[PDB]
Nucleic acid binder design. Structure first.
Ligand code: MG
Ligand code: ZN
Ligand code: ZN
Ligand code: ZN
Lengths: 97, 112, 267, 543, 171, 166, 107, 87
DNA sequence: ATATTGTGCAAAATGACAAAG
RNA sequence: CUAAGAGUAC
DNA sequence: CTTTGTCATTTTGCAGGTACTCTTATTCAATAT
């Protein structure tokens, strides 16, 4: 069943954030992807069985993080990259609120 | 005075058919519309032009143009809006997400 | 469009209303800090009526006979007459009521007396009357000083903003001014001793219930009031000489340079 | 089974930093240089090396692991390649921006036209937000048509101070399709501004100049608005009958090879120019096929090609169609019926739906017995269980499992079992114009094929029983369950914030009935009084 | 050289472990992961100072998971070699390509290119050694060496030392 | 800042470029800035022993080279558990090349080097290396060039050599 | 304050900003015939001192941009002679609570 | 963190637990109980983790603290024990 | 004999253009 | 499988 | 001589939410290996 935009709006108005996250991630599509702390791109080669992570270009192997994002979000970021845009994802703040 | 007149017009529209809406909702609407010093329309030309985060702005209208402008201008999205966390699939900072639940080890020991 | 415009508006832990950027939309939610679900329509008694009717309803004089009080109303009803300090208390209370009358007549120019306010005082008074078995004939156990000081303490206890500086205190007073006007209009000395005939324990119970209900009527931080307002405005629109209804709503939200019926009102 | 364990630290995204790809960054992140327009080799059974489906970009076959990461199609995100373009081309999305930028900067010396010496320039540069800075700078410098090698002094307009200006005359720039034509003032000389010269002039813009213009030194420089290395999205982005993106990439490679051969072998300038324009057109339509004026790049079947911008915009784009709202699991939908014998917060659930939708309950000493009983009951009878998930992530399907014998549950395991009575469930009717049109109900399993709900709760849902359908969502965790029961429950919604009054009431038959019951004429005899008293569940038992 | 620095580590605790001995579990799990460890960013990590009160802070329940993410801050004694720094050590092994000197927890490989020409390898000696006109370098022999090249790997720091400069060699 | 990529001058002790996180000032866990302190071999050994004996006391409530080596081995076994190979090698190296015995001498050394107002890295190197003459110290430590007068360095090395015991 | 009859020549407008701290303000008589601030729609505007602005920002934890804005061409702002960065406190008759105090920063 | 944390002596937020706070506390505690966390209360036969969490909240035996974030990034720590549950 | 290639708002932005100094 | 179109329910 | 405000054009982006069923169609034809 489609969980449309205004259903999301009703859940927001109810204030149930965890249920909204559960609907949009565990109930539809949860994808674990790897990024590096230097460039926020998903261009990390991850060999999980060998336990080896490496971002070519940045030339790093310990500044890696894993994030759970919707697979549609990963596809969107890859389509942005293919269209010459860098949606760098960072796991810490660089500015104050 | 513009904000007061705007509230009066919205209230007249709502009460034309005899319906009643609490004051605070229309007050919030007109306050948002006039918070920038002028009349900010509820349109792609209005509220969507405020520097409030590219990801949430693109979810409304002119999506790809917004992404292109954000890339060219190297905008930083701090992921405070609801749409940003919806897109990233993490608990938005709203309702039950407007705080952090932590652990009081001292209290935990104190209980036994 | 409305939902998208207002989606990020939230009430924060300092009771301000802010968007995703932290910009302040309202320094206190709804200009009173109250949850809409806890608001009920009630009448402001001071604003209405005539000056003579207002005096008869509220004025209490311990030194004359035109606006005296029946000694049977309260236990010490024959000793308070001729006193000075209690007359001072009544004088300041009546002066405050007159000031509230003027203030409300300034706020509501048309004189409308029924407005939505958080705590329903009438229901509390009825509950106390039916709970403590007020017989309406026995002299009241209350003392005038008890009434006045209890009302003042209750006003001090209606906290919306918890800060500890001049700005926050002034904002708190501005937040509770109208509800305090209502409270003084209802829990006046004359009304308490004559119309309602509360007792000491009943009066204390009324004060505690008013305080608890007012504290329970405060909006909760984290409430997504923007989405709520957008939906509360948009849902009636679906049910829907001068343009009105949905076309006029469109003319308003889309701030249109040219509108179909530009009319001007001259007094 | 999900995704196997990863040792990388788990964090949440805090900031999204936008920008543009530098060509050297494109080359650094790429894992393969795409050169051949074909996808499969001559054998038609494998992917051609160096082609558009290079196994280093990710495996197009479920049976083969990715050649780069050695992970299945379940794990491999896909890895970008890169096409090294023969000549620079404009990015279709930035063309106007590029025009504005080149209209703000000298086309010969690559310096901003009006330095701080100019009067309005201090006001323009004092602006804080980058967009308004750029707008002011552009509306100030667009009408300046000379580099002004020498300007009157800021102190007074008597002496002349020479800036680093070449003194040439800037042209008036227009766009004719995918290219920019500049007309220099006749001493007009009209000529197409080559993308190479514009790229060169952008590379000569000083750091201060383009950071005043609103660009970033590290994340987006103006010369990165010119394409010289196209990133190649992996097969995940264009899965296969090839995708439209694959065909457009093949066309881009064909045009690139044609231009490169025409340059290598020499040719008249006309042929080189035509090949360049073809490459520009292909690259542009690969990103935005809805360019005003130009004709849409049709597909082999004669239909317009689906560009990436088409994949992102619209109600069915990625954002609105897949991110702001998406199809979900553990949901049901069916026709609704009224039931005066159901509580206000109860919802009647068909037995088949209750047997389909499931909840994962963690095995605990407090629920070992009943969970074991449900597992014994199996998935074909209600109440029962449908799956058993072990602590290792392995999933046991209760169908085909009774052959292996009774399962001995252990604490920490999960039993994915049929939804039973009093399970909180979100109940929704569309269009769902307000929060009351989506409320939490308690499950009551009933033996018919319709959702059943109290008559009083139909008003907030705006629901009838003339064929209306409603949707049901099952929370899958204790947190979501709890906040559904404690925030969205029907009783908590009785008084609406919309107009500070209750939104549910007595309606329809009961309303009529109550008016008939409370008339002064109405009197009831002893037997009917006893019946009516017993019909009240909480009646204290005194007549 | 030996320093002490302010380090932090993010540990995650399962719901099962939240008992009165939670502080003990956090402190022990900081150990067995940082004690005796090696990182390229800060060198070797040998021990943790100030064990009596290590700043564990509050912890943070991860939503949808229930595990708590503590950010334990502590003081750790580290040994970070640096380029061009003289330090003492002991030889433990020798070979054709060079010889290894034990400095603290690390082994520094001085290559055969980075000794005076008079010093030459000798495999005839048991154990094999490096012999010159005036001195011989054997197993368990004190020697001072200057580090001139460091490659910073994470689980194994590698450094290059030399004795070509004046007053470098056996003590 | 969040600069993608990074350009850095190569680390070089002689240039005193110890690293962006090895600067002179470090923000402590309390939020204030403190000088980047460096431990000489004897001082580091004493600090390690103090920490380990404190840990042993906490667990309980909850000189000559051979005897010292045996005692540190027994205490190391009692206090911590496994993965102490690096720690053991460091501890035995410290006991072998320890320039001082007890707290008083290392305190005197650190205050004497403090009196110089010199860089912590340089004073730690001076206290660690058992140098003899002055030009020898300068060639051992290029960072000391054009920082301290020759006579002062030679004399302080003389008192340090005097403070050497066993 | 310069009060003119019909208009100002634009060549006179450019020299209106003189050497600071002196400021020149132009008003048209036709725009001054009616005092706009007596309209019941116009609430009470009170300019804040720098100390008051600092206290406000401190107490509400705000930045300059996080306050509601008032344009430096608004008729009330021109009436009070507001300048950029100055904050006006607005006192309003509210129908939920008797009095409501807002603040607007001149931009 | 030191600058972000507002000292306990001058917290200016409401002392009453909000509805969202109560919902999330009950959800988190129920989830932890469901994952075999220790229970700090006596059980009268209740088996649902959610109602176990409710019983724990009724007598203030939940060892959690809310970190209420202010719009500027500062925060106040309120123990569940001291928050008043009136709603 | 078969693969390969020849729509209607309505706001915003922009351009043309008679008056003004 | 994909795409387009048509009809339809509230 | 250049502004300057001003109209008349050009863009140009959008157009409720869910849900069901069925039908057709996937470049035609000429050329060369
Ligand atoms: Mg119907
Ligand atoms: Zn990287
Ligand atoms: Zn791969
Ligand atoms: Zn130039």
């Amino acid at each position: 069943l489609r969980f449309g935009e205004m259903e999301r709006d009703c859940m927001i108005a109810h204030g149930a954030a965890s249920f909204l996250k559960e609907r949009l991630m565990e109930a539809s599509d949860a994808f674990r992807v790897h990024i590096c702390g230097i460039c926020g791109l998903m261009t990390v080669i991850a060999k999980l069985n060998h336990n080896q992570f490496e971002c070519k270009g940045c030339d790093n192997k310990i500044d890696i993080y894993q994030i759970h994002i919707p697979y549609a979000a990963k596809l969107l970021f890859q389509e942005l990259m293919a269209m010459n845009i860098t949606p760098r994802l960072y796991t810490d703040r660089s500015r104050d609120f | 005075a513009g904000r007061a007149a705007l509230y009066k017009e919205v209230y007249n529209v709502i009460a034309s058919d005899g319906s009643y809406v609490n004051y605070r909702h229309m007050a919030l609407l007109v306050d948002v519309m006039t918070t920038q010093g002028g009349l900010t329309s509820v349109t792609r030309h209005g509220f969507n032009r405020s520097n409030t985060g590219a990801l949430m702005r693109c979810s409304f209208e002119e999506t790809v143009e917004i992404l292109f402008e954000a890339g060219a201008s190297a905008e930083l999205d701090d992921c405070r809006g609801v749409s940003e966390n919806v897109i990233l699939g993490q608990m938005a900072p709203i309702g039950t997400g407007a705080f952090d639940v932590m652990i009081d080890e001292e209290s935990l020991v104190k209980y036994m | 469009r409305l939902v998208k415009a207002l989606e990020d508006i939230m009430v924060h832990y300092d009771n301000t209303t802010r968007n995703s950027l932290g910009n302040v939309i309202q320094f206190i939610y709804g200009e009173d800090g109250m949850d809409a679900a806890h608001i009920e329509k009630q009448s402001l008694d001071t604003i209405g009526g005539s000056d003579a009717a207002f005096e008869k309803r509220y004025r209490v004089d311990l030194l004359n006979t035109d606006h005296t009080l029946d000694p049977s109303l309260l236990e010490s009803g024959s000793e308070i007459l001729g006193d000075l300090k209690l007359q001072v208390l009544l004088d300041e209370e009546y002066k405050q009521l007159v000031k509230d009358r003027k203030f409300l007549r300034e706020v509501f120019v048309d004189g409308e007396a029924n407005w939505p306010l958080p705590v329903n005082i009438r229901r509390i008074i009825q509950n106390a009357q039916q709970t403590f078995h007020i017989d309406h004939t026995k002299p009241s156990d209350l003392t005038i000083k008890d009434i006045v000081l209890g009302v003042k303490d209750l006003q001090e206890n209606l906290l919306v903003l918890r800060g500890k500086n001049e700005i926050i205190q002034n904002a708190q007073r501005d937040a509770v001014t109208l509800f305090c006007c209502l409270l003084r209009s209802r829990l006046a000395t004359r009304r308490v001793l004559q119309e309602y005939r509360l007792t000491k324990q009943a009066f204390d119970w009324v004060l505690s219930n008013i305080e608890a209900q007012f504290l329970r009527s405060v909006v909760h931080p984290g409430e997504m009031v923007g989405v709520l307002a957008a939906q509360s405005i948009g849902e009636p629109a679906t049910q829907m000489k001068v343009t009105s209804g949905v076309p006029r709503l469109k003319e308003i939200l889309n701030v249109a340079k040219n509108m179909k019926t530009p009319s001007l009102t001259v007094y | 089974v999900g995704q196997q364990y990863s040792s990388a630290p788990l964090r949440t995204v805090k900031e999204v930093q936008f920008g543009l790809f530098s060509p050297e960054e494109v080359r650094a992140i790429s894992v393969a240089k795409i050169r051949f327009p074909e996808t499969m080799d001559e054998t038609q059974t494998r992917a051609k090396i160096g082609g558009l489906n290079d196994p280093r970009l990710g495996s197009i076959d479920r049976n083969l692991k990715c050649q780069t990461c050695q992970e299945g199609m379940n794990e491999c995100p896909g890895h970008f390649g890169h096409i090294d373009l023969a000549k620079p081309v404009f990015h279709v999305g930035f063309i106007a921006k590029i025009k504005k930028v080149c209209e703000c900067v000298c086309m010969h010396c690559g310096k901003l036209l009006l330095d701080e010496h100019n009067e309005l320039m201090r006001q323009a540069l004092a602006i804080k937000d980058s967009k308004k800075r750029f707008a002011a700078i552009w509306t100030l410098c667009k009408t300046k048509m000379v580099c002004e090698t020498d300007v009157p002094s800021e102190d007074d307009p008597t002496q002349l101070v020479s800036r680093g200006g070449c003194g040439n005359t800037q042209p008036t720039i227009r766009k004719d399709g995918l290219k920019l034509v500049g007309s220099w003032k006749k001493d007009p000389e009209l000529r197409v501004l080559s993308t190479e010269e514009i790229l060169n002039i952008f590379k000569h813009i000083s750091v201060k100049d383009f950071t005043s213009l609103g660009f970033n030194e590290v994340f987006s420089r103006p010369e990165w608005m010119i394409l010289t290395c196209l990133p190649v999205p992996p097969p995940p982005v264009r899965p296969s009958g090839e995708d439209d993106l694959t065909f457009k990439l093949a066309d881009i490679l064909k045009a690139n090879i044609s231009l490169e051969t025409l340059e290598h072998n020499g040719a008249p300038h006309h042929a080189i120019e035509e090949a360049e324009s073809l490459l520009q057109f292909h690259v542009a339509t690969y990103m935005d096929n809805d360019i005003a004026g130009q004709p849409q790049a049709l597909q082999k079947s004669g239909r317009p090609v689906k560009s990436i911008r088409a994949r992102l915009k619209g109600k069915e784009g990625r954002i609105r169609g897949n991110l702001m709202g998406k199809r979900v699991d553990f949901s049901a939908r069916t026709v609704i019926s009224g039931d005066p014998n159901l509580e206000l917060d109860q919802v009647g659930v068909p037995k088949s739906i209750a047997k389909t939708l499931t909840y994962p309950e963690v095995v605990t000493p407090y629920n070992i017995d009943r969970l074991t009983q449900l597992v014994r009951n199996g998935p074909n009878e209600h109440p029962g269980a449908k799956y058993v998930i072990r602590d290792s992530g392995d999933r046991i399907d209760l169908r085909y499992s009774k052959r292996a014998g009774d399962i001995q549950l252990q604490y920490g395991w999960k039993v994915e079992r049929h939804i039973m009575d009093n399970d909180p469930v979100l109940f929704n009717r569309q269009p769902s114009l307000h929060k009351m049109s989506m409320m939490a109900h308690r499950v009551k399993v009933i033996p018919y094929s319709t959702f059943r709900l109290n008559l009083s709760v139909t008003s907030p849902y705006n629901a009838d029983f003339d064929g209306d359908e409603m949707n049901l969502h099952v929370p899958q965790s204790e947190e979501t369950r709890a906040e559904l029961s404690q925030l969205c429950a029907v009783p908590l919604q009785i008084v609406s914030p919309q107009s500070n009054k209750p939104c549910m009431g007595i309606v329809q038959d009961t309303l009529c009935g109550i008016r008939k019951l409370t008339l002064r004429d109405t009197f009831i005899e002893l037997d009917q009084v006893l019946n009516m008293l017993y019909w009240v569940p909480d009646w204290d038992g005194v007549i | 050289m030996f320093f002490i620095k302010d380090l932090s580590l993010n540990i995650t605790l399962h719901p099962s472990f939240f008992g009165p001995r939670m502080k003990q579990y956090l402190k022990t799990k900081l150990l067995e992961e940082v004690e005796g460890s090696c990182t390229g960013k800060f060198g070797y990590i040998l021990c943790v100072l100030d064990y009596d009160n290590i700043d564990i802070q509050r912890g943070r329940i991860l939503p949808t998971d229930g595990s708590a993410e503590f950010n334990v801050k502590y003081r750790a004694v580290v040994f970070k070699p640096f380029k061009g720094e003289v330090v003492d050590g002991t030889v433990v092994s020798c070979s054709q390509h060079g010889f290894e000197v034990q400095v603290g927890p690390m082994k520094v490989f001085v290559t055969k290119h980075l000794m005076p020409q008079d010093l030459t390898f000798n495999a005839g000696s048991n154990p094999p050694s490096y012999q010159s006109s005036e001195d011989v370098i054997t197993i368990k022999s004190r020697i001072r060496v200057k580090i001139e090249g460091c490659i910073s790997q994470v689980s194994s720091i590698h450094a290059i030392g030399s004795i070509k400069e004046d007053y470098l060699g056996a003590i | 800042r969040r600069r993608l990529k990074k350009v850095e001058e190569e680390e070089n002790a002689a240039t005193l470029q110890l690293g962006q996180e090895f600067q002179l000032k470090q923000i402590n866990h309390q939020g204030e800035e403190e000088e980047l302190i460096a431990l000489n071999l004897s001082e580091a050994r004493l600090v390690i022993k103090e920490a380990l004996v404190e840990r042993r006391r906490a667990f309980k409530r909850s000189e000559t080279r051979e005897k010292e080596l045996e005692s540190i081995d027994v205490l190391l076994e009692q206090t911590t558990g496994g993965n102490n190979k690096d720690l053991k090698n460091t501890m035995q190296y410290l006991t072998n090349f320890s320039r001082f015995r007890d707290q008083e001498t290392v305190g005197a050394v650190i205050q004497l080097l403090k009196s110089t107002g010199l860089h912590p890295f340089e004073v730690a190197q001076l206290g660690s290396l058992a140098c003899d003459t002055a030009d020898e110290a300068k060639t051992l430590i290029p960072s000391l060039n054009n920082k301290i007068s020759d006579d002062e360095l030679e004399r302080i090395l003389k008192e340090l050599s005097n403070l050497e015991t066993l | 304050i310069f009060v003119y009859q019909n208009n100002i020549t634009p060549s006179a407008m450019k020299l209106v900003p003189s050497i600071p701290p002196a400021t020149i303000e132009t008003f048209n008589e036709a725009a001054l015939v009616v005092n706009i601030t007596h309209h019941e729609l116009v609430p009470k505007h009170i300019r804040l001192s720098s100390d008051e602005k600092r206290e406000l920002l401190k107490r509400y934890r705000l930045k300059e941009s996080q306050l509601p804005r008032i344009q430096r061409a608004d008729p009330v702002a021109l009436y009070l002679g507001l300048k950029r960065g100055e904050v006006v406190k607005i006192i309003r008759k509210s129908e939920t609570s008797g009095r409501y105090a807002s603040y607007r920063i001149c931009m | 963190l030191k600058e972000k944390a507002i000292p306990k002596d001058q917290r200016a937020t409401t002392p009453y637990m909000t509805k969202y706070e109560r919902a999330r506390i009950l959800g988190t505690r129920a989830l932890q109980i469901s994952m075999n966390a220790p229970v700090f209360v006596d059980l009268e036969g209740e088996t649902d983790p959610l109602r176990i969490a409710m019983k724990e909240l009724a007598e203030k035996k939940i060892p959690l603290v809310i970190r209420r974030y202010l719009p500027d990034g500062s925060f106040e720590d309120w123990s569940v024990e001291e928050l008043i549950v009136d709603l």
